[PDB]
Amino acid sequence: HWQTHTVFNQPIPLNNSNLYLSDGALCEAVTREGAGWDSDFLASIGQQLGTAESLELGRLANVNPPELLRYDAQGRRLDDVRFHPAWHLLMQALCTNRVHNLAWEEDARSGAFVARAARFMLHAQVEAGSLCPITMTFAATPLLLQMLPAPFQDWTTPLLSDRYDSHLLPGGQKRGLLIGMGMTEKQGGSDVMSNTTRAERLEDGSYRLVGHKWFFSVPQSDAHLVLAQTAGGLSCFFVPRFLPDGQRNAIRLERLKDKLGNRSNASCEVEFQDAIGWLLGLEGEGIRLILKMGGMTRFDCALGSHAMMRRAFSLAIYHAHQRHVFGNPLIQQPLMRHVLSRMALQLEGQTALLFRLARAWDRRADAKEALWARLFTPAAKFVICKRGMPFVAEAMEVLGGIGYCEESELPRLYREMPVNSIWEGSGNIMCLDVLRVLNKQAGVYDLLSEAFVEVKGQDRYFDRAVRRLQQQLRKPAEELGREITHQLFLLGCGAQMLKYASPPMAQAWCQVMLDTRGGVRLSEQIQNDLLLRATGGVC
Amino acid sequence: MHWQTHTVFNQPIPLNNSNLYLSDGALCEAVTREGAGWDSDFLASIGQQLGTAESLELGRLANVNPPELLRYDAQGRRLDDVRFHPAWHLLMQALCTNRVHNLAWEEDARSGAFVARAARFMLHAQVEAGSLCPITMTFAATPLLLQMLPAPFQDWTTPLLSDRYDSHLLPGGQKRGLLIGMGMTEKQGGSDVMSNTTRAERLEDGSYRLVGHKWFFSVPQSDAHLVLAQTAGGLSCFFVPRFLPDGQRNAIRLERLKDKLGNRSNASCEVEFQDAIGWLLGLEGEGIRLILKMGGMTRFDCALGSHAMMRRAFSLAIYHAHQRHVFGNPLIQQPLMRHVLSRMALQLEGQTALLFRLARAWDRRADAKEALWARLFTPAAKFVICKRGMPFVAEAMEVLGGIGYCEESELPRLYREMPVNSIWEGSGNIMCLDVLRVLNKQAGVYDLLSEAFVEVKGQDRYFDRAVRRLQQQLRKPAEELGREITHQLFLLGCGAQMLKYASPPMAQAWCQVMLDTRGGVRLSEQIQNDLLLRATGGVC
Amino acid sequence: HWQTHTVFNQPIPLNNSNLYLSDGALCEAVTREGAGWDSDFLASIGQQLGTAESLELGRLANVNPPELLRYDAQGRRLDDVRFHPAWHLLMQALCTNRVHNLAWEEDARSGAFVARAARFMLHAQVEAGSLCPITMTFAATPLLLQMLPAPFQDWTTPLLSDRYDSHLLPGGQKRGLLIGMGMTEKQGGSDVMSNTTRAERLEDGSYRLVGHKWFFSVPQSDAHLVLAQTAGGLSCFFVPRFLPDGQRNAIRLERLKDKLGNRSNASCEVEFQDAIGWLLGLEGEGIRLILKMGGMTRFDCALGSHAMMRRAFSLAIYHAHQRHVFGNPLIQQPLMRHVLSRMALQLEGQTALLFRLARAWDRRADAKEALWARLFTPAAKFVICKRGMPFVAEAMEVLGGIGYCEESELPRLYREMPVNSIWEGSGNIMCLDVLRVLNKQAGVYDLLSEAFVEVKGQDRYFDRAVRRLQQQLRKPAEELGREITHQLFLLGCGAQMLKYASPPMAQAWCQVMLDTRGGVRLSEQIQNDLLLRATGGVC
Numbered sequence A, C: 001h002w003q004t005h006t007v008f009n010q011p012i013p014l015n016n017s018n019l020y021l022s023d024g025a026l027c028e029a030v031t032r033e034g035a036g037w038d039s040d041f042l043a044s045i046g047q048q049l050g051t052a053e054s055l056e057l058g059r060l061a062n063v064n065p066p067e068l069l070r071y072d073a074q075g076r077r078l079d080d081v082r083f084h085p086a087w088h089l090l091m092q093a094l095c096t097n098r099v100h101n102l103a104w105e106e107d108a109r110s111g112a113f114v115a116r117a118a119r120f121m122l123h124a125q126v127e128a129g130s131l132c133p134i135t136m137t138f139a140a141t142p143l144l145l146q147m148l149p150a151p152f153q154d155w156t157t158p159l160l161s162d163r164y165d166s167h168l169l170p171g172g173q174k175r176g177l178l179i180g181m182g183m184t185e186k187q188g189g190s191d192v193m194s195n196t197t198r199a200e201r202l203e204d205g206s207y208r209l210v211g212h213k214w215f216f217s218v219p220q221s222d223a224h225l226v227l228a229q230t231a232g233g234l235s236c237f238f239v240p241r242f243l244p245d246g247q248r249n250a251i252r253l254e255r256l257k258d259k260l261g262n263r264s265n266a267s268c269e270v271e272f273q274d275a276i277g278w279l280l281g282l283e284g285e286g287i288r289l290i291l292k293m294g295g296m297t298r299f300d301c302a303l304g305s306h307a308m309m310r311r312a313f314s315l316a317i318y319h320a321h322q323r324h325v326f327g328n329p330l331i332q333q334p335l336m337r338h339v340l341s342r343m344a345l346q347l348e349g350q351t352a353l354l355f356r357l358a359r360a361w362d363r364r365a366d367a368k369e370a371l372w373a374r375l376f377t378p379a380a381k382f383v384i385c386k387r388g389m390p391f392v393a394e395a396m397e398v399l400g401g402i403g404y405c406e407e408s409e410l411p412r413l414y415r416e417m418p419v420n421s422i423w424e425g426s427g428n429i430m431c432l433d434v435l436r437v438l439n440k441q442a443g444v445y446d447l448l449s450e451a452f453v454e455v456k457g458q459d460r461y462f463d464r465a466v467r468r469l470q471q472q473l474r475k476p477a478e479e480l481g482r483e484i485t486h487q488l489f490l491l492g493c494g495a496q497m498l499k500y501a502s503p504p505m506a507q508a509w510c511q512v513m514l515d516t517r518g519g520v521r522l523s524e525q526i527q528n529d530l531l532l533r534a535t536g537g538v539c
Numbered sequence B: 001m002h003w004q005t006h007t008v009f010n011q012p013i014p015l016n017n018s019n020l021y022l023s024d025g026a027l028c029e030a031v032t033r034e035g036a037g038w039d040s041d042f043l044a045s046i047g048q049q050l051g052t053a054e055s056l057e058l059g060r061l062a063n064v065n066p067p068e069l070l071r072y073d074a075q076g077r078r079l080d081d082v083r084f085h086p087a088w089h090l091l092m093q094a095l096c097t098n099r100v101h102n103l104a105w106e107e108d109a110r111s112g113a114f115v116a117r118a119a120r121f122m123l124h125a126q127v128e129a130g131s132l133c134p135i136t137m138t139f140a141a142t143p144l145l146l147q148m149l150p151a152p153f154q155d156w157t158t159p160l161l162s163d164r165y166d167s168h169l170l171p172g173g174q175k176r177g178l179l180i181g182m183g184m185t186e187k188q189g190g191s192d193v194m195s196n197t198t199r200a201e202r203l204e205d206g207s208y209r210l211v212g213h214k215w216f217f218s219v220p221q222s223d224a225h226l227v228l229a230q231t232a233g234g235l236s237c238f239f240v241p242r243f244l245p246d247g248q249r250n251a252i253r254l255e256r257l258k259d260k261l262g263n264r265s266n267a268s269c270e271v272e273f274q275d276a277i278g279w280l281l282g283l284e285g286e287g288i289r290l291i292l293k294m295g296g297m298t299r300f301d302c303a304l305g306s307h308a309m310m311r312r313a314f315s316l317a318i319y320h321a322h323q324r325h326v327f328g329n330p331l332i333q334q335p336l337m338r339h340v341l342s343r344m345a346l347q348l349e350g351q352t353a354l355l356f357r358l359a360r361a362w363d364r365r366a367d368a369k370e371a372l373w374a375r376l377f378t379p380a381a382k383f384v385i386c387k388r389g390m391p392f393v394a395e396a397m398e399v400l401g402g403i404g405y406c407e408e409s410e411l412p413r414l415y416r417e418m419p420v421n422s423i424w425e426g427s428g429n430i431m432c433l434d435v436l437r438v439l440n441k442q443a444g445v446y447d448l449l450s451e452a453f454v455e456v457k458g459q460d461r462y463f464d465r466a467v468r469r470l471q472q473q474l475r476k477p478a479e480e481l482g483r484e485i486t487h488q489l490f491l492l493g494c495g496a497q498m499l500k501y502a503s504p505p506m507a508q509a510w511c512q513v514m515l516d517t518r519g520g521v522r523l524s525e526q527i528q529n530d531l532l533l534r535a536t537g538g539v540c
């Protein structure tokens, strides 16, 4: 008699699922792209990462963001950052699963980049902030392994380990390392040539750095690769957190960013007060170096946005299956079932493209593969990271009101999305790069012709899309970089669907994405298969 | 460098990584003297563990990340749960591992257990105080439950005697360890519990339906609370479990979480009972009689807890004062400071002596004379010591100065905790009214005092004069002098202990400083040195 | 049937009362000490300040503490502090009521200091943090008015206004000002001789300051009087927030204290990076100057603590009067009544001593009056500020559990008390100063004897106390500085009680405070009278 009502028609939130085994498109991609040997392991962590206890860690790390500790209680400079225990727990698992170095092990087998991409994608569905140090370390490791200055040769062993080490010590004394990246300044992020951080050559071949970095993520990194001006031009420096003699480097943490999302991750405004750096490569070869690593971090952005889209979608279909409206399961409602099917179709294409791209990276020794990666990485980052926002927003709306409340995973996802689109130059820069590749790089047109010819006749909308692109690649105006990049990206997904997806699935994908007319209805059967694949049972 | 504007110097390193036990001379001597010497090795062991920086950090985390009340889930269903920072649970594990909640109630507990347990308690208290609340309540309630558990809960006996903290959201019977809370206070009264309006109706099966509220309901996550409610037969005490036997959640509704000055790591709720099921303990109307048994022990914990926090505050102060220089010399060498610090050390010596003598009384409660001693000095010790805590800790804070007023320091948290112990369980006045009630109603109280006072007569002139004043001060029966009488009675208790077991110079010092009404007592250079030295260890 | 219980015996909290007219001892003191002309105004603001709306401003200012803005969104240094709107409202009223300068107006009448003290004591009961800038400004004003450097002569008018101006502008362009004091450094606050902030003389006569201040309250002050080392000794500098040319002075705000209490008030850790200062007086004359101001701020500490004890006590008795326990009003319960009466008696004494002490300051032109002030100011600060903690804690306990909750005014008061005892050298330094006056000052022993002889024979306990002080002054050790200062303070209050208080009241006070035998019962008539005077009706 105390109650005013009974609570019903409230679906149970998705948890204790298998992030891997419930993703049909992913299972197929992993095996298809030569990482089948990691399938058992993927399912293993898929189950671990998908538990309530795991998702809670994600929540804790974000709602208890890091504190910047500039001083101690005595008034001495401290320059440290303090995290919630959940942060460290996430790091342990990321490093245990070698998301930061799997591909760089000395005996790493074929498909390692692809396998590692799958491992990454699972973690990304749980928590995103923690991916930042992992992404940076992953991209920087190959570079360091062959360019480490003499005083830090003993970093090789920890760089190749599977142990997270949060000890406040010099890198050489630690079990595992994290590498950060300091490029962006107040005057520019895309245009790094405008940096005003200067480096004066010190004695032993080291340099004195004086300047600042505007966005300096993971200040607790064991080292940052930093860009600074020298007499010889813009160079890249290895700036360790501790000097060889055990003293703390002269990096001053001034301010912690107060971010829309990505809140679990510490992003600082730092200043260099005669900090010591070691020159990597040659003076003026700075931009050339960070361009090598950029390729890989961009891929992580695209993959990360995709992972979050996948999670948001999983939450949405799980909810829509249980929630009833107007007498029927929400997911049975014609208009909803239509929207959800198009969303699933979106993820199928992205899964296909992203893991094809991963294969390219795994086989970068092949000039044709390296060129494929060089081209589609920026494209995938631009398109997928742009889609993230509208896509996650839609998922949120499938849940309705409760999806707009912070107790749900959706707001945090929705809040994270834009960071991936802004990171590393932003969309426009991606598109200018795509244009630059088509123009400057040799044998690009030949590479495209081969793939397009390989699937000609399989689908009318694809072939028409190919014709439209070649017509736009005659007079490629800069102001059409987005149109060109988008169309180029779709053709990439299209080819993959046509080659390896079932004919009905590819027919569906091509129609929905490449049919300019619109009004595209999907067969009852193809919709059922999409939604079924998106919940597993295809593994 | 050229970037700096100054050099940081004369800033002392904060006290950490010390041994909370081995650095307390008075405590080591007390433990051995009061028959708990067998626990000395263990005490030093946890004394080291608890005194580490990592441990102190747990204390800080538990307080600056206070519990959240979860009334509802994301679906709009009632949840009635409380979510803590991991540090809270870590503190609880250690407290239970160290059996601070049940050591004395083990079936084979040896002699001195209450005294040993008091020492274990005192160490923990210096680290974090909030976590002590569930421990204090469970410790006081356990003896009662062990022999009064209703039939459906006989399988609580094993967990009640364990050393395993269990935070699982399950019925008690399925758990490895338990916590018992206490629901007495209502909006209309805390001291006067007969004004309770929570009512209980007897049901067909022997349990009762409770409808009402509790104003301060600490540790709502307890596995059960002993609750007072009105019945047709009068004010009774009920065992109100969090889960019913059939695994369903009892009808206890958590409405509001208190936003407290201190004690913040501990969840204190405003709850309402919506036909919650309770099991009658004892007889209808025997309610106040039951919670009076348990009150004796929780009061002791309040006194000990305040003492522990005073000890910690003092440790921080002397450690600071030893390093900090002012006007060319170590702060602790400055005549006026060294004088204040010595009086503070002297304060703790007396409290240590009295509190652990009291702990012995509880350990030997089978002896009528000991039980009476406890019945008399427990309330007195709670009144005086818990009152002193505030000015005492404030003084410690001032020894550090500006930095002691900042929350990065342990001092503000200690300063903020202190009043809770004085307010808890009736408050100072109630303690004093109780002391007066014992002198009046209880038989052979005057005889008991006479024996102790005679045993030390002639040893100190200020003590004997203090004894004369008390016996006279009792000349006219008067409620409005309850505090004067309770305070004087307390000092005489400490005095006797110092005179019997402390060194003659130490006891001479204590008696002069505490009992010399003519004030202005200077202390010998030697006695001050010995006080401060004892307060840092080396006497163990 | 929805309810589980009925709420009763829950007293209404004290609000919408008159902070002045409810304080019998205060009304009498104001009239007695030559400030009876302000009575109509004191009752006026006493009404305004006691309102719920007023008290709410206090709460807001403290639960929404200031934020330090070291940088703006563009990464340019900003060094500003942002307050809750309630803070500025509190400031507006304080300045409107001239709590910061009443006594320094050019045509200030007799008893201005005593009237200002009364106004201060009322504001102090609503909010304490806001008193910091007021106290500092009040103490520095007289000094500045006759020492202002040439470039800041036009500061005279604003210094004497009733205007609060929070505009971020150079002083000269504002309608009112606030002055701060920067003395304490990390190495010491009591021993300022250990300061390492150094000032070099410049071409133009001003100085370059490089150093730091550990506690630096009201960083938003229009100027700070700062102590720094020069070639000729430790000196006092006028450091304006803006330079004459409008540029911001080189005062760098590094960090904001996270305080036990006093949270509404901004206290900073600051550093000087070649900040411009102007010498006040002669080099090495620094300590001599800040000693002149120290006199008045120490008085404000004592007054503030007294004020907060008064407020606490008002709350306690209003509560005890409504709250029932064991069938009677809590205030009727013999033990409670006894305690509350002693507390009231405590405030009677303090009120008498403080406003006699205020008279001394007002008539400081008389050497005998200045000497009385010189002696009892340090004493009153030591004793009263020390009593504050146990006193307010008692008040809190009268309310019980609800008094321990932050929704009550008690915790905020309780959290405030220690700051007044720590400010300006702390208790020990006060007692050392009192000893220095009894030793180094001439005619002190005479001044005291004149007062004691004037009341000899009126009370046995008072005379016995006098004989014990004179005996304790035979051998005046340093270690007895507290015992001596305490005894002195008591005799001070005692003299005032015996002279101007009703004989029964003076007897009660003497018996309670000076009867070493303890165990004093008070008559039912004197208790009824004490509590009646503490709720007004004597005005």
Ligand SMILES: Cc1cc2nc3c(=O)[nH]c(=O)nc-3n(C[C@H](O)[C@H](O)[C@H](O)COP(=O)(O)OP(=O)(O)OC[C@H]3O[C@@H](n4cnc5c(N)ncnc54)[C@H](O)[C@@H]3O)c2cc1C
Binding pocket: A181, A182, A183, A184, A187, A188, A189, A190, A191, A215, A216, A217, A218, A259, A262, A267, A419, A422, A423, A424, A425, A426, A427, A428, A429, A432
């Ligand atoms: C959460 C977070 C963390 C970060 N962490 C780091 C870090 O760890 N290390 C680091 O170095 N940086 C970091 N950054 C900075 C980030 O890399 C840059 O912000 C990003 O590269 C864009 O630089 P910017 O902000 O200066 O944008 P701007 O350079 O001002 O660019 C503005 C816009 O102009 C567009 N644009 C640029 N050139 C052209 C052109 N020729 N034609 C048309 N449009 C153009 C860009 O697409 C962009 O959208 C972080 C940023 C965020 C939000």
Ligand SMILES: Cc1cc2nc3c(=O)[nH]c(=O)nc-3n(C[C@H](O)[C@H](O)[C@H](O)COP(=O)(O)OP(=O)(O)OC[C@H]3O[C@@H](n4cnc5c(N)ncnc54)[C@H](O)[C@@H]3O)c2cc1C
Binding pocket: B181, B182, B183, B184, B185, B188, B189, B190, B191, B192, B216, B217, B218, B219, B260, B263, B268, B420, B423, B424, B425, B426, B427, B428, B429, B430, B433, C323, C325, C326, C330, C333, C334, C335, C336, C397, C398, C399, C400, C401, C402, C404
């Ligand atoms: C952090 C915290 C946690 C708490 N947790 C719990 C809990 O878990 N369970 C629980 O039951 N209670 C709890 N309490 C309540 C606490 O036990 C009561 O607040 C306390 O007993 C005082 O009662 P009260 O607040 O009703 O004050 P009142 O009973 O209104 O008394 C107020 C004052 O009156 C004095 N007084 C009472 N009677 C007399 C008399 N005859 N003569 C003179 N003076 C008298 C009291 O000593 C006290 O100073 C908690 C309180 C706090 C602050």
Ligand SMILES: Cc1cc2nc3c(=O)[nH]c(=O)nc-3n(C[C@H](O)[C@H](O)[C@H](O)COP(=O)(O)OP(=O)(O)OC[C@H]3O[C@@H](n4cnc5c(N)ncnc54)[C@H](O)[C@@H]3O)c2cc1C
Binding pocket: B324, B326, B327, B331, B334, B335, B336, B337, B398, B399, B400, B401, B402, B403, B405, C181, C182, C183, C184, C185, C187, C188, C189, C190, C191, C215, C216, C217, C218, C259, C262, C267, C419, C422, C423, C424, C425, C426, C427, C428, C429, C432
């Ligand atoms: C909220 C707040 C605001 C503040 N604002 C300001 C401000 O605006 N400007 C400013 O300059 N300071 C400020 N302070 C600091 C305050 O003035 C100092 O902290 C105070 O003077 C004591 O200095 P300290 O902390 O260095 O104590 P210390 O100098 O380390 O003193 C330590 C203790 O030893 C005692 N002592 C010192 N010398 C002796 C001796 N010879 N014999 C016996 N005992 C002795 C002292 O009384 C003190 O209790 C502020 C502090 C607080 C908490």
Ligand SMILES: [Cl-]
Binding pocket: A068, A069, A070, A071, A072, C255
């Ligand atoms: Cl900081």
Ligand SMILES: [Cl-]
Binding pocket: B069, B070, B071, B072, B073
């Ligand atoms: Cl809730």
Ligand SMILES: [Cl-]
Binding pocket: A255, C068, C069, C070, C071, C072
């Ligand atoms: Cl800032």
